[PDB]
Amino acid sequence: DMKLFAGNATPELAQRIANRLYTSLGDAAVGRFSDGEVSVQINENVRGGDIFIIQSTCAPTNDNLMELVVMVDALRRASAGRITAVIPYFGYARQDRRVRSARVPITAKVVADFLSSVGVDRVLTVDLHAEQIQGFFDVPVDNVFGSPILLEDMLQLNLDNPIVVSPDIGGVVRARAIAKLLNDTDMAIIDKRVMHIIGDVAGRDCVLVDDMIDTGGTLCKAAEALKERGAKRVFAYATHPIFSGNAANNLRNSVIDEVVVCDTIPLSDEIKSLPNVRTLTLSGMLAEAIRRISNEESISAMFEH
Amino acid sequence: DMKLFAGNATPELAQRIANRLYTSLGDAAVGRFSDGEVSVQINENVRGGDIFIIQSTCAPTNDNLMELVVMVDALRRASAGRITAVIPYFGYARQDRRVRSARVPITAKVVADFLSSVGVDRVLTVDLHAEQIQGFFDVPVDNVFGSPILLEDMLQLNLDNPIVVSPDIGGVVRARAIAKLLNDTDMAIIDKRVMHIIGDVAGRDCVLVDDMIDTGGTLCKAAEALKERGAKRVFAYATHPIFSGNAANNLRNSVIDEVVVCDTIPLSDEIKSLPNVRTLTLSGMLAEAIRRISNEESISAMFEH
Amino acid sequence: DMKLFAGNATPELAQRIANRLYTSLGDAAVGRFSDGEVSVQINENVRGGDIFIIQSTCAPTNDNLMELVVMVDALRRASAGRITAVIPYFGYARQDRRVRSARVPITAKVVADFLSSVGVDRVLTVDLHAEQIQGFFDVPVDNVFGSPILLEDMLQLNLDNPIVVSPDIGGVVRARAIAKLLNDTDMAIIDKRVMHIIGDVAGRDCVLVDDMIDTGGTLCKAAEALKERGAKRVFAYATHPIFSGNAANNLRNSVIDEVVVCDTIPLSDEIKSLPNVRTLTLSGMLAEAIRRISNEESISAMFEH
Amino acid sequence: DMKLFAGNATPELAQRIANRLYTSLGDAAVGRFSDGEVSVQINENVRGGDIFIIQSTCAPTNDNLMELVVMVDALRRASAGRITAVIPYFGYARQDRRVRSARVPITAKVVADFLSSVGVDRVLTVDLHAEQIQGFFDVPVDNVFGSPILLEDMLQLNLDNPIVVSPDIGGVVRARAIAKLLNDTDMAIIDKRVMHIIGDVAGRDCVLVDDMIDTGGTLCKAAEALKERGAKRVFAYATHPIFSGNAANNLRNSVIDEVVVCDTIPLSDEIKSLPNVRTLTLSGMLAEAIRRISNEESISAMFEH
Amino acid sequence: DMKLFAGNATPELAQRIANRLYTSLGDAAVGRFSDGEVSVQINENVRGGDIFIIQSTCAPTNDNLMELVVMVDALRRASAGRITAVIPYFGYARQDRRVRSARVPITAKVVADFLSSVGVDRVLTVDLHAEQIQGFFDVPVDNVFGSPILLEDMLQLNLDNPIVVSPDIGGVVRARAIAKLLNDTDMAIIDKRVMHIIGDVAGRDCVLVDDMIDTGGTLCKAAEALKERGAKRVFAYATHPIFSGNAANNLRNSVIDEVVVCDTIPLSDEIKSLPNVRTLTLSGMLAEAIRRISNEESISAMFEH
Amino acid sequence: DMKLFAGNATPELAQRIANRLYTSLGDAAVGRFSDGEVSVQINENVRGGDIFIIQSTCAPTNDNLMELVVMVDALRRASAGRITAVIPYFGYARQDRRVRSARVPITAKVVADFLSSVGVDRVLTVDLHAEQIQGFFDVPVDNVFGSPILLEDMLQLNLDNPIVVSPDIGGVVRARAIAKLLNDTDMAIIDKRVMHIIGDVAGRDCVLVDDMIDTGGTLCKAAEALKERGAKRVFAYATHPIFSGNAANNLRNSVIDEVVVCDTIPLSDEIKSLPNVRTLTLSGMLAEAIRRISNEESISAMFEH
């Protein structure tokens, strides 16, 4: 009784997930009216079904989120059994954007409350900030991780002497975990006092790890700082290729030799033109997670022995 | 303790209302981040205050609505006393858009629930469809009407022998009311069997009345149909100048001599270039309504003796 | 696991539905105490069952609605699995009753909220005003239509040259739909300027169509107006036989030759004494709808090819 | 900013309260439509006001309760500041009606939830069962007592040697309290094994005390049982004169010399014809309670030194 | 799909129930941090399962209740299907504790609301005060009774001429029911004017019945009062052995020959040292109730033919 | 109309705040029953008042939290106007306690929801983790900071050459802020690879800064690590003196010369016996914050020019 629907944010990823589930996307016409309002209508029978909506809240964030909530409402009024919102990238949840006024909203809370109000039953995201936002949901949240796929790709290319360098001081726990998993290699930290790199970096291959790349910026500066001191090659691995701002003149005019990202965001054409940017796929893991959520099997058993 | 804030949809109308209230707009920086997410921060002290947010949900509808709800959340977390959302045009509430699938959402209900969830205390709209949407709100809704201003402008230009013609069959009650108010003049109906005009139209001045103009379309066709039979001049009066689609080649290539609208929507530049389109202002009525809501005075006493 | 319960509004219709489902009504003693309060007690085991309550909110409206909500509460506290309220006629939902004070409640909203609060999971009505009230429910609403049965009875009696006449101007969409379905016959409108009948009516058989008959009134006046100009016979078809006020001296002292109604309201004895009033039955359609709701089958597939 | 409104249950008591507050009842037309649905419309301006609704939920209980909730909704949608429901007698709250099925609703809970849902802010009742029902309300409940007025009337008529006799075993705490207050007189209990009267009753004046009289019944039987053994006179004092069933042939064909009740229920004409039934008034206490609730003064200071 | 979890209040009773269900307690580490906060973590996979939590809210009440709600939250965030809270003794629900200030909370309501908020779906208690507290829950409550087991143990020891004596006047209904069930024996009441025992007690065996024993106190005084007049033996039967205060010097320094209680509370060691205190077990009835709740079978059919 | 109430967690701090407000604590008897349940009763009249409850949720956490929610319920049922919960230390909110099972509750969310459910209107805490927990509250939260008082005490004792050292890597932002405020002194970090101290520490006075001290532990180890390399004196400044575990043998058997804490937790006697532990007071700041919250003045204006 599992049915898959998709919006307009990630149609390719939705098609890949549908292919790996040996099914097809549902028949729903999701489009825009003349004045810009979201138009949604369901042409299938979804009564009592187990519905999954694959809709990342990537740029344009507001249109995608409105599509998501309007589809949820249309499916809830059509007597759908359970609605799961598969959101590969959760939009209004970034923590590294704080302009100092102290009178600011909590937009992740707003989005979580609106999702719960419109009728969402479950959430399945990828690499959420798994310390804060899971408390904003009154519905169960299944957070799956893109780290295993990125790490299994890291092990493929046979780095000389890998060292994991966190691009900043906030994200050192993830770097430590990846370093421990990756053959228990060495450890390094970039600190912005200028740059204060901590550890030994000389004649090695560095692997910067992050959950996001917005405008290059911090990653490009960290790569430059640790390549000033004779790092052989610099590989930057990220899960969410937001690539806003310029992010195409920052990557080209940089010393990073390869940026590896996942396919949670469509990765617009100008980035595709770059030669040193390669994208992985989360379709297999997301399909397995969807199948296990539908059948009430252990999601955590997918990531550990 | 009344404070006024504005977003980015209607900044001119908000400034006019603030001028007529002998006050100034509050200091809130409402803008966009690099990736398109709404950024809101309040630079004033709004603790215990009586806050009004002037934000029409016009095109682009989703960005404007997200600005509105994010401002409401930011003000609610800043210990604002009461939050009133002054929405001159309510976006996802049109009834004349029905594509036949029968599995469709009720978007006005979704917007009303999200407004109530984020922390809105009152709503003040202009010319809402005052039979359905007021039941979707669990907060009080003050619906003020743009009919008195349009009618007082109608009486100014000294029509030869005015006759009120409803552009379609759904909106005949409003046409009857305006005809009764306007010196108890004659009555006519356009019916789409082709066009089936009902009543006497010959050597008179016709005044089409509607609450909205989207793409010309129905109004242009009605004007052509009733000018086939020797109508002297045709004036179309509307409250909400949505003007989507073309709405600039429809108006120019038409026989309408003057289109009079209100200022609930910014009325983009290409429409401004047209010579036969003139806009009124609702700033005085909205300012009086805001002042009466703040002081708990009779709003209905503003429109009747 | 389907169980059927009934109150005191429509016991005959409930028995007919139970007969067509090859089952029997549940054992619940629904009665009145000495002081007039509703007494409800369930003598069956309804734990985990799929419960349906057949209770029209017809006159006396308040007693019937109180019976309905008290039965819902009694079944919800008895660990019933799902409760569906089959309401053939929704009571506080009429739109053609507006006395002008502008300070009035929305009673349909009140009833919907109270139904949702007491523990109703689904609603199944017949010929609701399917543009407004479905937004007042936060539970799914299945609106089934009595039009197919009335129309299939219309086609039986072999009208000479049928023409569909809407009794007023508000309900012209339904008349147009029925005219299109009924061999694509002609079209006519009654307008109250006196009566302003639009179209050709002479030597034909007219079929007035409405969703309700309260006191004769509008239908009797329309029949008189269109029989002034040589209409052969006049048949009035309605879904809800409210028949309040007099509605028995209006029908007898009228020129309508046959009034055909459905059995959503018990149709009290004085109306039964009339010879020109004949009632159809919705028991088959309601039984099929109940069976399809219980088994999660397509309700819309019942009404279209 | 205090305004008083009334329904159709207790219009005389509402008028008395309005007279003692030196004000007048608000202008609201509360009536019935042709089909029996409650019609409510507010002809006053109640924006920001402090509204009190005086509406007992006495027989007919369902119509009165529907009037109450419809008035509450009409006032809440008219931007009323605070709504207090003054309910002199709470209807669906009796505990001495238990038919043994164990699958029964809790109707007091249903009424409390519906009152809270429709928009009631406070409740002010008289002689509620102040151990259970106050937990069913999520709004503050002010329970005032009719005991002081009944007791001050008891002390007036100069009983020979008063003894307080509880009509049954459940209500012995109230009898003990009244006996302690009434000059610390003696104590007696009626027990239904036949009747098992406990204590000394001979040559004395007995004063049965209860919060309600439904059909005579228990009180008449207790009076007969304790007058079998030479009780001089028997006075029955109650707060709520429900007087359902017969309650007019039970009182006449009884040995009770005087039944004293309050005016929370209109006390229909046949009871008025009886000579041995006298009614007190709670209008003064209710007016003082309303005035103290509006001004945020101590209600409990009204009943104690 | 049934899983059983336990806290730290009643681990022995939970183990007995798990043994009678031919299963084992789930793997959850419920403990305390250094500062006293409750630590809970689930080491099993409970996705989609039917979870039961066996946790009495006995002394220490606050720690046990916090353990219960924290386990409920941990299981709800782990995608548990349905959570049933098996609470053999409900803590904040006693009615025989009223200190006179009239400004007091309703703690049973607070606990019920917090249980409903944290995510509890059903409640299964033993010998609750089944007239008030069941209305405080918006989730179904299954109240099972320890009376059959106590009564079947009463019939075992072959009393000479049993007479059921209620320890006070409030609990006479339960005493009457047990007397009717126990061979329809005689009836007696203890009344505190000193003690006013009602009925014949001489040369008989008395069986005091209560739902609770807190500090001896009332039961010890009643036993002394009815043994002043030549009662052969006095047996006190209770369901909840709270045994607070002293309750060990009251029982030893008393004339009660045997106190029989159930195992809803762990019955601390000093009480175990007493020779005249014997405990029964509710594990069989609770296991049957759990099995019937999981399989949606009639609970009431467990207690009657 | 401001009234102050206190529980049993922090009676001294509550008395100090009441003294600085020139008022007295309200008359509420907050105690324990025999079985350990919280007993609360209000002996004052709090109708319409502006109530503040000063109750830290410190050890024993569960008893203190239950006292808090029971007082809130008792005051809400007594018609209190607004209830503000002044919680100097929020209990179930620590983030540095993560045992790895991934099936764990979010206890801060549970406490926030229960506070909102029982009827709390506002929260005023001290040095909360101001990035996560403020989103768990649907009521406004006023987070005041103990940093200004600790820093003004730091500047008093005339350190030789102060350097701020963060005890770990998570809390480096607060250390950077305090270093910038404290004459823009130098910066250092302790990193646990053993200890990896970053920066220059030799012949200086180090000032470790943290929001909490639980068991010494991390702070003692950091002090030892940075005193291995010739630090003159080591001062540890904290806001919340939890001091659980041993925390009295860790501090004595350490090289820290002075531990300065605030008075949000009663700081039990064994810690008082230590000579090198000195406590500050937040009573002035909390009194000013309470006064400004009551009068709707700017709280943020208290901490900045």
Short mmCIF file of N, CA, C and O in Angstrom, two decimals, chain E residues 181-216:
data_model
loop_
_atom_site.label_atom_id
_atom_site.label_comp_id
_atom_site.label_asym_id
_atom_site.label_seq_id
_atom_site.Cartn_x
_atom_site.Cartn_y
_atom_site.Cartn_z
N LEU E 181 -22.12 -10.07 47.25
CA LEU E 181 -21.40 -11.14 46.57
C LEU E 181 -21.03 -12.27 47.52
O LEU E 181 -21.10 -13.45 47.15
N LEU E 182 -20.63 -11.93 48.75
CA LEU E 182 -20.17 -12.93 49.72
C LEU E 182 -21.38 -13.55 50.40
O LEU E 182 -21.75 -13.22 51.53
N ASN E 183 -22.04 -14.46 49.68
CA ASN E 183 -23.15 -15.26 50.18
C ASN E 183 -24.30 -14.41 50.71
O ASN E 183 -25.12 -14.90 51.49
N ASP E 184 -24.38 -13.14 50.29
CA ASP E 184 -25.43 -12.22 50.72
C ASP E 184 -25.50 -12.13 52.24
O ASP E 184 -26.56 -12.29 52.86
N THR E 185 -24.35 -11.87 52.86
CA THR E 185 -24.26 -11.83 54.31
C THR E 185 -24.80 -10.49 54.83
O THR E 185 -25.35 -9.68 54.08
N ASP E 186 -24.63 -10.25 56.13
CA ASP E 186 -25.24 -9.11 56.80
C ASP E 186 -24.46 -7.84 56.46
O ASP E 186 -23.53 -7.85 55.65
N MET E 187 -24.82 -6.72 57.09
CA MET E 187 -24.31 -5.42 56.70
C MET E 187 -24.11 -4.56 57.94
O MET E 187 -24.90 -4.63 58.89
N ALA E 188 -23.05 -3.75 57.94
CA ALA E 188 -22.75 -2.91 59.09
C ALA E 188 -21.97 -1.68 58.63
O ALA E 188 -21.30 -1.70 57.60
N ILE E 189 -22.06 -0.61 59.42
CA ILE E 189 -21.42 0.66 59.10
C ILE E 189 -20.76 1.22 60.36
O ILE E 189 -21.35 1.21 61.44
N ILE E 190 -19.54 1.73 60.21
CA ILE E 190 -18.89 2.52 61.25
C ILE E 190 -19.09 3.99 60.94
O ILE E 190 -18.79 4.45 59.83
N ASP E 191 -19.59 4.74 61.91
CA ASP E 191 -19.84 6.17 61.75
C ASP E 191 -19.12 6.94 62.85
O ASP E 191 -19.21 6.58 64.02
N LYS E 192 -18.42 8.00 62.46
CA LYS E 192 -17.67 8.84 63.39
C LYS E 192 -18.49 10.10 63.65
O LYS E 192 -18.46 11.05 62.86
N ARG E 193 -19.23 10.10 64.75
CA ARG E 193 -20.06 11.23 65.12
C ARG E 193 -19.23 12.48 65.37
O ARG E 193 -19.76 13.58 65.51
N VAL E 194 -16.15 10.10 68.51
CA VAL E 194 -16.36 8.71 68.89
C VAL E 194 -16.81 7.90 67.68
O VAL E 194 -16.90 8.43 66.57
N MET E 195 -17.09 6.62 67.90
CA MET E 195 -17.53 5.72 66.84
C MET E 195 -18.98 5.31 67.07
O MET E 195 -19.37 4.97 68.19
N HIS E 196 -19.77 5.36 66.01
CA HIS E 196 -21.18 4.98 66.04
C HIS E 196 -21.36 3.80 65.08
O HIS E 196 -21.69 3.99 63.91
N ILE E 197 -21.15 2.59 65.59
CA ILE E 197 -21.31 1.39 64.78
C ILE E 197 -22.79 1.10 64.61
O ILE E 197 -23.56 1.16 65.58
N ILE E 198 -23.20 0.81 63.38
CA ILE E 198 -24.59 0.55 63.05
C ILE E 198 -24.71 -0.92 62.65
O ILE E 198 -23.95 -1.40 61.80
N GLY E 199 -25.65 -1.62 63.27
CA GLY E 199 -25.88 -3.02 62.98
C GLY E 199 -25.54 -3.90 64.16
O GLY E 199 -25.16 -3.44 65.24
N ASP E 200 -25.69 -5.21 63.94
CA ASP E 200 -25.47 -6.21 64.96
C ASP E 200 -24.08 -6.82 64.78
O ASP E 200 -23.80 -7.41 63.73
N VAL E 201 -23.23 -6.68 65.79
CA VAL E 201 -21.90 -7.29 65.79
C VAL E 201 -21.66 -7.95 67.14
O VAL E 201 -21.33 -7.27 68.12
N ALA E 202 -21.84 -9.26 67.20
CA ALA E 202 -21.63 -10.00 68.44
C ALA E 202 -21.45 -11.47 68.10
O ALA E 202 -22.33 -12.08 67.49
N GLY E 203 -20.31 -12.04 68.49
CA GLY E 203 -20.05 -13.44 68.22
C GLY E 203 -19.90 -13.78 66.76
O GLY E 203 -20.12 -14.93 66.37
N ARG E 204 -19.52 -12.81 65.94
CA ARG E 204 -19.36 -13.00 64.50
C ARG E 204 -17.93 -12.71 64.09
O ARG E 204 -17.11 -12.24 64.88
N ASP E 205 -17.63 -13.00 62.83
CA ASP E 205 -16.35 -12.68 62.21
C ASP E 205 -16.57 -11.52 61.25
O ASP E 205 -17.34 -11.64 60.30
N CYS E 206 -15.90 -10.40 61.51
CA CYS E 206 -16.07 -9.20 60.72
C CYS E 206 -14.98 -9.10 59.66
O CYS E 206 -13.83 -9.50 59.91
N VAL E 207 -15.34 -8.58 58.49
CA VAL E 207 -14.41 -8.45 57.37
C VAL E 207 -14.49 -7.00 56.90
O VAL E 207 -15.34 -6.64 56.08
N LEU E 208 -13.60 -6.16 57.41
CA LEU E 208 -13.50 -4.79 56.93
C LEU E 208 -12.95 -4.79 55.51
O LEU E 208 -12.01 -5.52 55.19
N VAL E 209 -13.54 -3.96 54.65
CA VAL E 209 -13.15 -3.88 53.25
C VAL E 209 -12.81 -2.44 52.92
O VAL E 209 -13.54 -1.52 53.29
N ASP E 210 -11.69 -2.24 52.23
CA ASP E 210 -11.29 -0.92 51.78
C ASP E 210 -10.41 -1.07 50.54
O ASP E 210 -9.90 -2.15 50.25
N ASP E 211 -10.26 0.03 49.81
CA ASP E 211 -9.40 0.06 48.64
C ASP E 211 -7.97 0.47 48.97
O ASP E 211 -7.12 0.47 48.08
N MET E 212 -7.69 0.82 50.22
CA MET E 212 -6.40 1.39 50.58
C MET E 212 -6.20 1.29 52.08
O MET E 212 -7.16 1.32 52.85
N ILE E 213 -4.94 1.15 52.49
CA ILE E 213 -4.53 1.29 53.88
C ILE E 213 -3.30 2.19 53.88
O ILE E 213 -2.26 1.82 53.32
N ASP E 214 -3.41 3.37 54.50
CA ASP E 214 -2.31 4.32 54.50
C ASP E 214 -1.45 4.19 55.75
O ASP E 214 -0.25 3.92 55.67
N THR E 215 -2.05 4.39 56.93
CA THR E 215 -1.32 4.41 58.19
C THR E 215 -2.05 3.59 59.24
O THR E 215 -1.98 3.91 60.43
N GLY E 216 -2.74 2.54 58.84
CA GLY E 216 -3.66 1.90 59.75
C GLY E 216 -4.76 2.89 60.05
O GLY E 216 -5.63 3.13 59.20
#
